[PDB]
Amino acid sequence: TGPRTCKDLLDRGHFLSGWHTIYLPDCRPLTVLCDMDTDGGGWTVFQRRVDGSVDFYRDWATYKQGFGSRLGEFWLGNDNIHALTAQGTSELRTDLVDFEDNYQFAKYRSFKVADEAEKYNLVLGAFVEGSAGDSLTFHNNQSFSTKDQDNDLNTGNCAVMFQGAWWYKNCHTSNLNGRYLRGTHGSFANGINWKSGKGYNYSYKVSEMKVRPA
Amino acid sequence: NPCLTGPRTCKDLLDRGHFLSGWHTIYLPDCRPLTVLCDMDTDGGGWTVFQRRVDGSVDFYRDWATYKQGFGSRLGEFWLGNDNIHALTAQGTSELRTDLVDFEDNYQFAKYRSFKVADEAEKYNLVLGAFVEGSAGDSLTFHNNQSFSTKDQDNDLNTGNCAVMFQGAWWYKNCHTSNLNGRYLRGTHGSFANGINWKSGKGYNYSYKVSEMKVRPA
Amino acid sequence: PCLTGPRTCKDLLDRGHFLSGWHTIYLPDCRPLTVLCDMDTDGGGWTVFQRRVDGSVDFYRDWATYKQGFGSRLGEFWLGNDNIHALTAQGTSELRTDLVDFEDNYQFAKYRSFKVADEAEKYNLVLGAFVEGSAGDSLTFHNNQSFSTKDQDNDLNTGNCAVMFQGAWWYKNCHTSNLNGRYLRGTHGSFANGINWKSGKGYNYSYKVSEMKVRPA
Numbered sequence: 001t002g003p004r005t006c007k008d009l010l011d012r013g014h015f016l017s018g019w020h021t022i023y024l025p026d027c028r029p030l031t032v033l034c035d036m037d038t039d040g041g042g043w044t045v046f047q048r049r050v051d052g053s054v055d056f057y058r059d060w061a062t063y064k065q066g067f068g069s070r071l072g073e074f075w076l077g078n079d080n081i082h083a084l085t086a087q088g089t090s091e092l093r094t095d096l097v098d099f100e101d102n103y104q105f106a107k108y109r110s111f112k113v114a115d116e117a118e119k120y121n122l123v124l125g126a127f128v129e130g131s132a133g134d135s136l137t138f139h140n141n142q143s144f145s146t147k148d149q150d151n152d153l154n155t156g157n158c159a160v161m162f163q164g165a166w167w168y169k170n171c172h173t174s175n176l177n178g179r180y181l182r183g184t185h186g187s188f189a190n191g192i193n194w195k196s197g198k199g200y201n202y203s204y205k206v207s208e209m210k211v212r213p214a
Numbered sequence: 215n216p217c218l219t220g221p222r223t224c225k226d227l228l229d230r231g232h233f234l235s236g237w238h239t240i241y242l243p244d245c246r247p248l249t250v251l252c253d254m255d256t257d258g259g260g261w262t263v264f265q266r267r268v269d270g271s272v273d274f275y276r277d278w279a280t281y282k283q284g285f286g287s288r289l290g291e292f293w294l295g296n297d298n299i300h301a302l303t304a305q306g307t308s309e310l311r312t313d314l315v316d317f318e319d320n321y322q323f324a325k326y327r328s329f330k331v332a333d334e335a336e337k338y339n340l341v342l343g344a345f346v347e348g349s350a351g352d353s354l355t356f357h358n359n360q361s362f363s364t365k366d367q368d369n370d371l372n373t374g375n376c377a378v379m380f381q382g383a384w385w386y387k388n389c390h391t392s393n394l395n396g397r398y399l400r401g402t403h404g405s406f407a408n409g410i411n412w413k414s415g416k417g418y419n420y421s422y423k424v425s426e427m428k429v430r431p432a
Numbered sequence: 433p434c435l436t437g438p439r440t441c442k443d444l445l446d447r448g449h450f451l452s453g454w455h456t457i458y459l460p461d462c463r464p465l466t467v468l469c470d471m472d473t474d475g476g477g478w479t480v481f482q483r484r485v486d487g488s489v490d491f492y493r494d495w496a497t498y499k500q501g502f503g504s505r506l507g508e509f510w511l512g513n514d515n516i517h518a519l520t521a522q523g524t525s526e527l528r529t530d531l532v533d534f535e536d537n538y539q540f541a542k543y544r545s546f547k548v549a550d551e552a553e554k555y556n557l558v559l560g561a562f563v564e565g566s567a568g569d570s571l572t573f574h575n576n577q578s579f580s581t582k583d584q585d586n587d588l589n590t591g592n593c594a595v596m597f598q599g600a601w602w603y604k605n606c607h608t609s610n611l612n613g614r615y616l617r618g619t620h621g622s623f624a625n626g627i628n629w630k631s632g633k634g635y636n637y638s639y640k641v642s643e644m645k646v647r648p649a
């Protein structure tokens with residue numbers, strides 16, 4: 001019955017990025033990171049990597065509730081991301097920065113995750129544009145997986161083989177919750193990787209995933 | 215009714231016992247709430263920080279409308295916004311402090327007895343009081359009584375465009391001895407005077423690690 | 433003991449604040465204080481009262497500064513001796529100390545009990561048994577000892593350890609740890625005047641990160 005999105009806050013004159021309280025579909029308050037600069041601002045950031053201070057190789061219960069720090073890296077929580085994206089349409093933007101401070105991005109028409117009972121299934125709309133290329137449409141219609149809850153399409157455990165948590169199939173083309181392996185790495189596809197961007201052997205300095213009413 | 219009971223400046227906050235720097239809501243003269251960064255640590259504390267550079271994560275080469283409303287992040291770097299800075303300095307007398315740190319941990323500062331920014335109709339004209347003291351030396355008096363300029367709105371006193379030439383936004387004259395909204399060029403640069411430069415401090419070829427501009431009632 | 437709102441960061445965690453960051457708690461008879469909650473480390477629910485991370489803040493401060501606290505929520509701070517006593521008195525608050533080096537290697541110590549008494553009583557450190565910690569014990573030595581600053585010599589050394597080692601601490605024969613020391617950025621030739629944990633990295637290495645925190649045992 002007040003601000004429901006970061007877009008609402010932007011329209012009310014909140015021009016600086018930072019943490020604000022919004023009110024979810026059910027009226028539950030949630031303190032979220034608003035990106036008010038990028039691409040018109042008004043984005044609610046649900047994932048952020050910047051320096052490798054936080055361990056992202058976490059189990060189901062931890063990804064469900066969210067983890068990390070307001071002062072740095074975090075995953076907002078799958079329950080929260082479902083609430084955020086349940087009804088209406090949120091467009092997704094992915095922002096990626098390499099160690100030479102070059103920026104890439106990918107933008108999708110719509111994005112949402114189902115509730116826990118449906119394994120926080122990815123529901124993704126068309127790739128609109130992005131200098132990072134499209135490395136997420138591959139994962140469309142897939143259950144989320146973590147090390148202790150394998151819902152993927154591999155005989156082995158993708159979350160373990162690539163040290164992350166994602167909507168793994170057999171196995172991935174993106175892996176943003178992968179290990180903070182600074183820049184080029186010999187090890188295959190176990191960093192913060194975006195196949196169509198810098199490839200399976202380059203772990204980004206910065207990663208942000210964010211949503212805005214479409 | 216929290217406008218009448220709420221703090222109106224960072225100094226009110228310090229007086230109420232907030233001893234750590236951090237973002238707090240204050241109430242502007244027209245009762246509009248604004249979340250600002252208070253500096254409680256430096257020089258007696260109670261300063262409202264309106265510009266901060268720290269790591270080059272935010273692009274400061276922005277247009278008139280963006281400087282007007284403010285941009286950046288409470289997580290790090292930002293410009294509070296010219297409308298806000300006018301609102302903060304329109305009434306009474308605010309002193310100004312500039313804190314600068316180089317990449318070798320050398321701290322420098324400059325202090326001015328008063329600092330006032332006019333409204334948009336006057337293009338955010340700078341009215342600067344006397345230089346008080348400072349190891350950074352005085353690189354702002356030169357800019358007294360100049361309109362603010364951005365790349366897309368040239369209000370400087372140069373035949374060309376200072377904001378474009380020096381890749382920032384400032385109360386440019388013809389053109390500058392300070393350029394704190396310049397590019398984050400990380401230490402010494404070969405390019406001329408287009409970084410976070412304070413001439414009397416580290417010169418036209420050295421871009422500071424940290425910049426903060428802040429005001430306090432005096 | 434507040435029953436109207438959150439008393440500790442532990443309370444906040446059990447209420448569903450799962451991200452670390454600055455929150456408001458209600459101290460014991462029942463004043464508000466905005467504190468840094470660490471919700472990830474060792475199960476979460478830690479209230480952080482010291483933090484070093486980048487050397488932006490001068491920790492070589494006098495008695496009155498350490499009393500009321502200083503620093504910034506954006507980085508380095510000391511919560512204030514008055515706040516720390518109000519927070520820990522009794523209690524049985526678990527003390528934890530987190531330490532990180534310049535190649536991102538993690539160490540950290542834990543203690544079963546922690547409190548400082550009020551100003552009258554020199555904010556004496558009262559420490560319970562060391563429990564565990566890959567950093568080793570460099571705080572027990574300092575048990576039952578006055579806090580000292582540059583303008584308040586309360587150690588057992590003929591000189592002033594605070595000036596000699598450039599900080600503030602529960603110095604005695606001097607120190608075995610110096611977390612409020614100078615941010616000397618890794619290895620240093622100057623002796624023991626840095627953010628040092630003798631059992632961890634000794635008197636010649638200044639840590640990159642250092643956090644002292646508490647949670648109800």
Ligand SMILES: *[C@@H]1O[C@H](CO)[C@@H](O[C@@H]2O[C@H](CO)[C@@H](O)[C@H](O)[C@H]2NC(C)=O)[C@H](O)[C@H]1NC(C)=O
Nearest residue numbers: 336339340341342357358359360361369370371
């Ligand atoms: C600020 O600068 C303006 C120019 O933009 C100054 O205006 C001039 O002031 C002188 C007297 O000092 C007059 O003789 C001129 O005719 C004025 N010119 C214009 C264009 O108005 C103004 O005086 C300055 N104000 C201060 C406080 O220094």
Ligand SMILES: CC(=O)N[C@@H]1[C@@H](O)[C@H](O)[C@@H](CO)O[C@H]1O
Nearest residue numbers: 118121122123124140141142143
């Ligand atoms: C609606 C439909 O029949 N299409 C497919 C369905 O067959 C499949 O079971 C599901 C998950 O794989 O993804 C749907 O898009």
Ligand SMILES: OC[C@H]1O[C@H](O)[C@H](O)[C@@H](O)[C@H]1O
Nearest residue numbers: 017035036037038272286287
């Ligand atoms: O430009 C300001 C900057 O602030 C924070 O770092 C946000 O996470 C970024 O997306 C950006 O908004």
Ligand SMILES: OC[C@H]1O[C@H](O)[C@H](O)[C@@H](O)[C@H]1O
Nearest residue numbers: 277278279280334366367368
């Ligand atoms: O002052 C208004 C005017 O300012 C500059 O020229 C900018 O390009 C716009 O903000 C424009 O409308």
Ligand SMILES: [Ca+2]
Nearest residue numbers: 154155156157
């Ligand atoms: Ca499998």
Ligand SMILES: [Ca+2]
Nearest residue numbers: 368372373374
């Ligand atoms: Ca011009």
Ligand SMILES: [Ca+2]
Nearest residue numbers: 587589590591
């Ligand atoms: Ca002595």
